Write an enzyme that holds these catalytic residues in place. Structure first.
Site, PDB file in Angstrom:
ATOM      1  N   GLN A  51       0.998  -0.951  -0.217  1.00 25.44           N
ATOM      2  CA  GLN A  51      -0.176  -0.274   0.351  1.00 25.44           C
ATOM      3  C   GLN A  51       0.803   1.443  -0.514  1.00 25.44           C
ATOM      4  O   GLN A  51       1.302   1.451   0.836  1.00 25.44           O
ATOM      5  CB  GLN A  51      -0.652   0.173   1.053  1.00 25.44           C
ATOM      6  N   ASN A  88       0.747  -1.239 -10.218  1.00 27.49           N
ATOM      7  CA  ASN A  88      -0.767  -0.954 -10.166  1.00 27.49           C
ATOM      8  C   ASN A  88      -2.186   0.105  -9.851  1.00 27.49           C
ATOM      9  O   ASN A  88      -2.920   0.917  -9.734  1.00 27.49           O
ATOM     10  CB  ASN A  88      -1.612  -2.114  -9.542  1.00 27.49           C
ATOM     11  N   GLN A 135      -8.419  -5.290 -14.639  1.00 30.82           N
ATOM     12  CA  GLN A 135      -7.937  -3.699 -15.049  1.00 30.82           C
ATOM     13  C   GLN A 135      -7.802  -2.489 -14.532  1.00 30.82           C
ATOM     14  O   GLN A 135      -7.359  -1.832 -14.519  1.00 30.82           O
ATOM     15  CB  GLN A 135      -7.216  -3.919 -16.322  1.00 30.82           C
ATOM     16  N   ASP A 174       4.747  -5.466  -9.429  1.00 34.57           N
ATOM     17  CA  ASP A 174       3.393  -6.626  -8.999  1.00 34.57           C
ATOM     18  C   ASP A 174       2.505  -5.780  -9.882  1.00 34.57           C
ATOM     19  O   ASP A 174       1.818  -4.862 -10.344  1.00 34.57           O
ATOM     20  CB  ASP A 174       3.772  -6.165  -7.598  1.00 34.57           C
ATOM     21  N   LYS A 177      -1.190  -8.457 -13.756  1.00 33.17           N
ATOM     22  CA  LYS A 177      -2.494  -8.819 -14.073  1.00 33.17           C
ATOM     23  C   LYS A 177      -3.566  -7.729 -14.198  1.00 33.17           C
ATOM     24  O   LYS A 177      -4.128  -7.198 -15.595  1.00 33.17           O
ATOM     25  CB  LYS A 177      -3.311  -9.545 -14.141  1.00 33.17           C
ATOM     26  N   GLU A 200       4.742 -10.339 -11.975  1.00 34.63           N
ATOM     27  CA  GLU A 200       3.733 -11.435 -11.351  1.00 34.63           C
ATOM     28  C   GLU A 200       2.378 -11.118 -12.033  1.00 34.63           C
ATOM     29  O   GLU A 200       1.092 -10.427 -12.237  1.00 34.63           O
ATOM     30  CB  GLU A 200       3.369 -10.870 -10.179  1.00 34.63           C
ATOM     31  N   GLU A 207      -8.769 -17.793 -17.368  1.00 34.79           N
ATOM     32  CA  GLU A 207      -8.637 -16.161 -16.632  1.00 34.79           C
ATOM     33  C   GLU A 207      -9.377 -15.164 -18.341  1.00 34.79           C
ATOM     34  O   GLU A 207      -8.899 -16.014 -19.445  1.00 34.79           O
ATOM     35  CB  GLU A 207      -7.378 -15.671 -16.816  1.00 34.79           C
ATOM     36  N   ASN A 262       5.790 -18.938  -3.153  1.00 37.47           N
ATOM     37  CA  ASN A 262       6.645 -17.089  -2.904  1.00 37.47           C
ATOM     38  C   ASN A 262       5.321 -16.951  -1.397  1.00 37.47           C
ATOM     39  O   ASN A 262       4.729 -17.511  -0.872  1.00 37.47           O
ATOM     40  CB  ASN A 262       5.656 -16.874  -4.111  1.00 37.47           C
ATOM     41  N   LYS A 300      13.434 -18.925  -8.152  1.00 35.45           N
ATOM     42  CA  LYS A 300      13.394 -18.482  -6.611  1.00 35.45           C
ATOM     43  C   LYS A 300      13.474 -19.123  -6.108  1.00 35.45           C
ATOM     44  O   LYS A 300      12.345 -19.942  -5.783  1.00 35.45           O
ATOM     45  CB  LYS A 300      13.248 -16.935  -6.845  1.00 35.45           C
TER      46      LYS A 300
HETATM   47  C1  LIG Z   1      -2.506 -11.470  -3.553  1.00 35.92           C
HETATM   48  C2  LIG Z   1      -2.908 -11.496  -4.837  1.00 35.92           C
HETATM   49  O1  LIG Z   1      -4.471 -11.171  -5.454  1.00 35.92           O
HETATM   50  C3  LIG Z   1      -4.375 -11.774  -6.841  1.00 35.92           C
HETATM   51  O2  LIG Z   1      -4.702 -12.419  -7.271  1.00 35.92           O
HETATM   52  C4  LIG Z   1      -5.602 -13.239  -7.527  1.00 35.92           C
HETATM   53  C5  LIG Z   1      -5.218 -13.704  -8.845  1.00 35.92           C
HETATM   54  O3  LIG Z   1      -5.539 -12.821  -9.657  1.00 35.92           O
HETATM   55  C6  LIG Z   1      -6.406 -14.608  -8.959  1.00 35.92           C
HETATM   56  O4  LIG Z   1      -6.127 -15.411 -10.645  1.00 35.92           O
HETATM   57  C7  LIG Z   1      -6.560 -15.874  -8.415  1.00 35.92           C
HETATM   58  O5  LIG Z   1      -7.625 -16.503  -8.259  1.00 35.92           O
HETATM   59  O6  LIG Z   1      -6.639 -15.043  -6.253  1.00 35.92           O
HETATM   60  C8  LIG Z   1      -5.609 -14.301  -6.577  1.00 35.92           C
HETATM   61  C9  LIG Z   1      -6.311 -13.621  -5.337  1.00 35.92           C
HETATM   62  O7  LIG Z   1      -6.802 -15.026  -4.444  1.00 35.92           O
HETATM   63  C10 LIG Z   1      -3.687 -10.548  -7.565  1.00 35.92           C
HETATM   64  O8  LIG Z   1      -4.183 -10.457  -9.167  1.00 35.92           O
HETATM   65  C11 LIG Z   1      -2.358 -10.078  -6.949  1.00 35.92           C
HETATM   66  O9  LIG Z   1      -1.379  -9.854  -7.678  1.00 35.92           O
HETATM   67  C12 LIG Z   1      -2.365 -10.500  -5.766  1.00 35.92           C
HETATM   68  N1  LIG Z   1      -0.952 -10.831  -5.358  1.00 35.92           N
HETATM   69  C13 LIG Z   1       0.120  -8.862  -5.063  1.00 35.92           C
HETATM   70  C14 LIG Z   1      -0.748  -7.530  -5.155  1.00 35.92           C
HETATM   71  C15 LIG Z   1      -0.547  -7.626  -4.167  1.00 35.92           C
HETATM   72  C16 LIG Z   1      -1.006  -6.411  -4.045  1.00 35.92           C
HETATM   73  O10 LIG Z   1      -0.084  -5.000  -3.579  1.00 35.92           O
HETATM   74  C17 LIG Z   1       0.044  -7.891  -2.901  1.00 35.92           C
HETATM   75  O11 LIG Z   1      -0.386  -8.248  -1.695  1.00 35.92           O
HETATM   76  C18 LIG Z   1       0.203  -9.330  -3.357  1.00 35.92           C
HETATM   77  O12 LIG Z   1       1.642 -10.002  -1.805  1.00 35.92           O
HETATM   78  C19 LIG Z   1       1.234  -9.888  -4.094  1.00 35.92           C
HETATM   79  O13 LIG Z   1       2.180 -11.061  -4.421  1.00 35.92           O
HETATM   80 CA   LIG Z   2      -6.097  -1.794 -12.869  1.00 36.91          CA
HETATM   81 CL   LIG Z   3       6.362 -13.559  -7.687  1.00 34.65          CL
END
Ligand SMILES: C=C1O[C@H](O[C@H]2[C@H](O)[C@@H](O)[C@H](O)O[C@@H]2CO)[C@H](O)[C@@H](O)[C@@H]1N[C@H]1C=C(C=O)C(=O)[C@H](O)[C@H]1O
Ligand SMILES: [Ca+2]
Ligand SMILES: [Cl-]
Length: 448
Positions: A51, A88, A135, A174, A177, A200, A207, A262, A300
């Protein structure tokens, strides 16, 4: 040569700098993915780092001088730094940041309410049928930046370019998507040179937004790897992994960033209970050995802290390098990157980088497998509960070798610290691997 990086999750800048010098550099790790170094909301939870409040380098990891010091010290040790970059969004609600700045009502030191998309919520169902909402709407209330805006792109690119000027070599984009691939292409046009960039994108199929859309802007996280590897190691047969990678429908090897787990999926975010983590002990060792020996993707290693079942909790209240005492392996920092099987797997990958083919695959149709990397190395994993005593064929020179998963070759190359593996005159090895154990040998760990 360098082939593997590590995520030092929630490690402060002083701990990372010391780790580069004392361990990562000597052991051959290529780089370190650090936690977001920019100003973020106050609070003890690990997710406060995601955040952002501004792009000033004052975070829970330390201040700007400590960050610069870490980049220099790691660089001198031969280890690059990859910065977790938030492209984002900005913080939700209102509050105060780690550098003293205030924000609220989508108003930040560097962004106005007009620099964000109009508020809307990303619902779980949107992932499968509405790319516009995925998005343009908010990820759990996080203020969604208008990434098509020239001002927003300039501001993020200036941050990335400032980091490169300090010496940062790579970036994790980060929540990629949630940003149109075309916006990332425009952003990259403003980025100096060609740093390492991995995006990421969680895509297990079905999807509205696919991982393949991001292949032209950098590497992409291949989440199918973590899930399928975990599922096979727990519920399937290792014999199935003979064609792991593109054969299973994964993206091109040269575009993928892979991992056993991860920071998100070890906590149940984007991954189920089949994902293997440090909690699984020896199962984790074996899964890592496979990943590091197998020629698919850029891996990684994960480096975690025992969160004691609290999925919101921040890291330990004690540094890793604590007054000459290493706070690893117990209930604070886990330090998986130092686990003998994992560091040995990294050593194997580093020393077989001149042969990316899987040669002489052997399996017992179930949970005993063995394969080589031509004459550069050979490995074997036994996940059955009876000793693996099969004779396997290798392309390696006959002689004595250190099982690098259990020890290493001495400076004078006259002895090993762990068990010795013998390659017969005909190239075969008469295996002797106990249940839930493994071996790996390479041409640069041969006894003289
Ligand atoms: C924590 C993640 O949330 C989202 O992931 C979702 C996937 O996109 C979806 O396909 C899956 O079914 O459900 C996931 C949620 O449970 C976001 O797409 C993903 O970017 C996110 N992870 C990163 C984003 C953050 C916000 O800055 C952080 O809190 C996370 O630690 C990041 O790794
Ligand atoms: Ca966006
Ligand atoms: Cl990652």
């Amino acid at each position: 040569t360098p082939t593997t990086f590590v995520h030092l999750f929630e490690w402060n800048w002083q701990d990372v700098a010391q780790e580069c010098e004392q361990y990562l550099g000597p052991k051959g790790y290529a780089a370190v993915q650090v936690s977001p170094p920019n100003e973020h909301i106050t609070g003890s939870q690990w997710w406060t780092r995601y955040q952002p409040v501004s792009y000033e380098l004052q975070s829970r990891g330390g201040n700007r001088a400590q960050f610069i010091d870490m980049v220099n010290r790691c660089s001198a040790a031969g280890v690059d730094i990859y910065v977790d970059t938030l492209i984002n969004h900005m913080a939700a609600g209102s509050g105060t940041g780690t550098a003293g700045n205030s924000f609220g009502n989508k108003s930040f030191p560097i962004y106005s309410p007009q620099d964000f998309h109009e508020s809307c919520t990303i619902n779980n169902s949107d992932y499968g049928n509405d790319r516009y909402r995925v998005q343009n709407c908010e990820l759990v209330g996080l203020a969604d930046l208008d990434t098509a805006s020239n001002y927003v792109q300039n501001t993020i690119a200036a941050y990335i370019n400032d980091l490169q000027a300090i010496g940062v070599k790579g970036f994790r984009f980060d929540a990629s998507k949630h940003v149109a691939a075309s916006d990332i292409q425009s952003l990259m046009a403003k980025v100096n040179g060609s740093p390492v960039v991995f995006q990421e994108v969680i895509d297990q199929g079905g999807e509205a937004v696919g991982a393949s859309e991001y292949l032209s802007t950098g590497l992409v996280t291949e989440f199918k790897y973590s899930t399928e590897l975990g599922n096979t190691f727990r519920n399937g047969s290792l014999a199935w992994l003979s064609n792991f990678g593109e054969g299973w429908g994964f993206m091109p090897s040269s575009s993928a960033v892979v991992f056993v787990d991860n920071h998100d999926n070890q906590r149940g975010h984007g991954g189920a209970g089949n994902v293997i983590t440090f909690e699984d002990g020896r199962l984790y060792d074996l899964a890592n050995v496979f990943m590091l020996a197998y020629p698919y993707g850029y891996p990684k290693v994960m480096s975690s802290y025992d969160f004691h079942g609290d999925t919101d909790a921040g890291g330990p209240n004690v540094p890793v390098h604590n007054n000459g005492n290493l706070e690893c392996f117990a209930s604070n920092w886990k330090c998986e990157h130092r686990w003998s099987y994992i560091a040995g797997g990294v050593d194997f990958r580093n020393n077989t980088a001149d042969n990316w083919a899987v040669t002489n695959w052997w399996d017992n149709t179930n949970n005993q497998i063995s394969f080589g990397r031509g004459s550069s190395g050979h490995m074997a994993i036994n996940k059955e509960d009876s000793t693996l005593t099969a004779t396997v064929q290798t392309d390696m020179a006959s002689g004595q070798y250190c099982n690098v998963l259990k020890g290493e070759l001495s400076a004078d190359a006259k002895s090993c610290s762990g068990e010795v593996i013998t390659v017969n005159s005909d190239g075969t090895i008469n295996l002797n691997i106990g249940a839930w154990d493994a071996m790996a040998i390479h041409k640069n760990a041969k006894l003289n």
